[PDB]
């Protein structure tokens, strides 16, 4: 739940190296 | 500067069923003043609409611009209306009374 | 022409039997990399050709 | 892979949207300030004229 | 035969000779090569010289102007005679201005053969 | 045209910065090759999905289902399920799109 | 009766600059254009600001009290019937390197109003083109409201 | 010709099976402000992945059966 | 299209000539080519083709396949035993009955 949202979205919002 | 088949009344199909009248009004007032709107009700006419604008240029540039608009997973198919028949008599009594008003008021004869 | 079509029949049957040759990680890396490219170029997809289309 | 990628694309799209929009709100406020101040300085030939 | 048919027929004359492929020397205008006078007719009754000239000067300098107005009231009868400075400009004007709408009235142009002064 | 392409390549090389200086041990390599079987190893499932990234899914499915047909010579018939038919009129587009995916593999997203 | 004139008559100007049954006096120059700098008009009514006017998408805007023709109806009866015209007119100039080029700039012109158009609250000489620069204020008739001219980057 | 028309003109030109409505009194008031001042109050993409569906496929515009092709203007009649 | 009369003349021709001489069979029919005679025999008229209704085994197959190899009907079809046109129409059919 909590760690899921935290780490998941912190990875998504920097997952594309070109942006 | 218009081709005569231009009308201030156009025929629209490919609408979403049951589409919200307010949407209808502003979607179409992305061009100007809407004099009137009719949506079909019997299932055969369900999903299409006659739209009566109050300005020639409004209606025409609407038919220029929106034709080829996609909302609700379908392109809005439009055409000009051919108001080529009448559907009931033009009511002589009130007609002559309002023109009698015209003449009584403005003193022509 | 006949010898080539014998060989090509065999290539297609071998494909269906020995499976797809692009593994799964290779396919996913290719797919994801393409997605990243297009998203950084702000490409917008070509839509299906409308009926009321000008051209 | 495509479910995953569609979610990632959407999240970054909305993050980017929001950031740009709030920046343009700041910009509009800067503009309106500058306009009002120029009106005041006016209340208180480097030009082109025609015949 | 109202004047609008006399417009339609001059235009027919042009486009018919076009379909036939006539050389510029045996054009029907060639019968007029000795007269720089055109007749304009159908004009509205409010246009003056100033307007007729500001309109028809597009194709040359205008040497003479003769707007024929009813002598009793002085008001225009609605037709004019016009003398260009080069016959060729009359060619141009007849081809180009015959059938234009000025204020709803669709005026008409054609050469003049043996003009007599007034 | 291709000869003006050659001209532009030559003077692109000549215009790089200090491209001729070998004083301090630099070296310029020019490599040129092919892809050896591209049209023949295109995979129609991965191709469907890479195309949907780009087109509408109706067109994506039309293209991919158009590549999978029966191929006939006098009495030999077989079904194409692996490669790509190059005699389809939209083969130019498919080949150049797949080629772009591979230019991203060779070059990298950053370069 | 009347004589053979050599003077004009409203027929030509009528049929050309007619619009909704009011002959317009002014017509667009040859050098009009549509601006790329997107300009904006900030209206104030005595320190109470109004909604903004984005005027970047025409070549000219005509202001007068006749509302059913004009773009921006100025409605304080000191306002003329056809009063002024915003107009982006491409003019050329000499850049730092002397190479000549063209940027479309905004200009105002008075259409012969009764009371007058106030740029910097100075009355101008009508029927002339006045170049509108950054931050400038404009005032129509003897009317209450004023307009400042800006563009998005300014 | 452009001269506006009345309620019975509209009922005289349109066929039946139709419901007439100004959407809100505000959509009538929207029409009131729309015509009045339309000078832009703000003159208003990128890569998005698409979500597969059926509707555009499902819309049909030719009479199903063994009928000829129905042009894009006789839609009015047929 | 094809009519019962052409179809029965085809069946008889094929049953006399065999399935590789499409050119004389196409000579027997009017308004028909060998390409079209061949296509018709191998699409509909062949008595190997089965026109029954789908066992629900066949339909669970159809669904599983049409997901694993999307849009590839000439490849899917022999793995279940009906032509590609039948597989495809019946698949859209299940899809809309399920929608």
UniProtKB/Swiss-Prot annotation, chain B:
GO terms for molecular function: mRNA binding; RNA binding. Pfam families: RRM_1. The modification N6-acetyllysine is found at residues 18, 30. Residues 5-18 are annotated as: Interaction with pre-mRNA branch site. There is a cross-link at residue 18 (Glycyl lysine isopeptide (Lys-Gly) (interchain with G-Cter in SUMO2)). Its main location: nucleus. One of its GO terms (biological process) is mRNA splicing, via spliceosome. Belongs to the SF3B6 family. Component of the 17S U2 SnRNP complex, a ribonucleoprotein complex that contains small nuclear RNA (snRNA) U2 and a number of specific proteins. Part of the SF3B subcomplex of the 17S U2 SnRNP complex. SF3B associates with the splicing subcomplex SF3A and a 12S RNA unit to form the U2 small nuclear ribonucleoproteins complex (U2 snRNP). Within the SF3B complex interacts directly with SF3B1. Component of the minor spliceosome, which splices U12-type introns. This is Splicing factor 3B subunit 6.
From Swiss-Prot, chain C:
The chain holds residues 780 to 834 of 2335 of the full protein. Transmembrane segments: none annotated. It is found in: Nucleus; Nucleus speckle. This is Pre-mRNA-processing-splicing factor 8. The MPN (JAB/Mov34) domain mediates interaction with TSSC4 and SNRNP200. Has structural similarity with deubiquitinating enzymes, but lacks the residues that would bind the catalytic metal ion. Part of the U5 snRNP complex. Component of the U4/U6-U5 tri-snRNP complex composed of the U4, U6 and U5 snRNAs and at least PRPF3, PRPF4, PRPF6, PRPF8, PRPF31, SNRNP200, TXNL4A, SNRNP40, DDX23, CD2BP2, PPIH, SNU13, EFTUD2, SART1 and USP39. Component of the U5.U4atac/U6atac snRNP complexes in U12-dependent spliceosomes. Within the minor spliceosome, which acts on U12-type introns, interacts with PPIL2 and RBM48. Core component of U2-type precatalytic, catalytic and postcatalytic spliceosomal complexes. Found in a mRNA splicing-dependent exon junction complex (EJC) with SRRM1. Widely expressed.
Curated annotation (Swiss-Prot), chain E:
There is a cross-link at residue 8 (Glycyl lysine isopeptide (Lys-Gly) (interchain with G-Cter in SUMO2)). Coiled coil: none annotated. It is found in: Nucleus. Disulfide bonds: none annotated. It comes from the Eukaryota. Residues 36-114 form the RRM domain. Belongs to the IST3 family. Involved in pre-mRNA splicing as component of the activated spliceosome. As a component of the minor spliceosome, involved in the splicing of U12-type introns in pre-mRNAs. Part of the activated spliceosome B/catalytic step 1 spliceosome, one of the forms of the spliceosome which has a well-formed active site but still cannot catalyze the branching reaction and is composed of at least 52 proteins, the U2, U5 and U6 snRNAs and the pre-mRNA. Component of the minor spliceosome, which splices U12-type introns. This is RNA-binding motif protein, X-linked 2. It comes from Homo sapiens. The chain holds residues 1 to 118 of 322 of the full protein.
Curated annotation (Swiss-Prot), chain H:
It is found in: Nucleus; Nucleus speckle. Phosphorylated. Phosphorylation occurs concomitantly with the splicing catalytic steps. The record marks 72 as: Interaction with RNA. There is a cross-link at residues 19, 36 (Glycyl lysine isopeptide (Lys-Gly) (interchain with G-Cter in SUMO2)). There is a cross-link at residue 19 (Glycyl lysine isopeptide (Lys-Gly) (interchain with G-Cter in SUMO1)). The modification Phosphoserine is found at residue 6. Transmembrane segments: none annotated. The modification Phosphothreonine is found at residues 32, 40, 42. Component of the 17S U2 SnRNP complex of the spliceosome, a large ribonucleoprotein complex that removes introns from transcribed pre-mRNAs. The 17S U2 SnRNP complex (1) directly participates in early spliceosome assembly and (2) mediates recognition of the intron branch site during pre-mRNA splicing by promoting the selection of the pre-mRNA branch-site adenosine, the nucleophile for the first step of splicing. Component of the 17S U2 SnRNP complex, a ribonucleoprotein complex that contains small nuclear RNA (snRNA) U2 and a number of specific proteins. Part of the SF3B subcomplex of the 17S U2 SnRNP complex. SF3B associates with the splicing subcomplex SF3A and a 12S RNA unit to form the U2 small nuclear ribonucleoproteins complex (U2 snRNP). Within the SF3B complex, interacts directly (via HEAT domain) with SF3B3, SF3B5, SF3B6 and (via HEAT domain) with PHF5A. The SF3B subcomplex interacts with U2AF2. Identified in the spliceosome C complex. Belongs to the SF3B1 family. This is Splicing factor 3B subunit 1. It comes from Homo sapiens. The chain holds residues 395 to 475 of 1304 of the full protein.
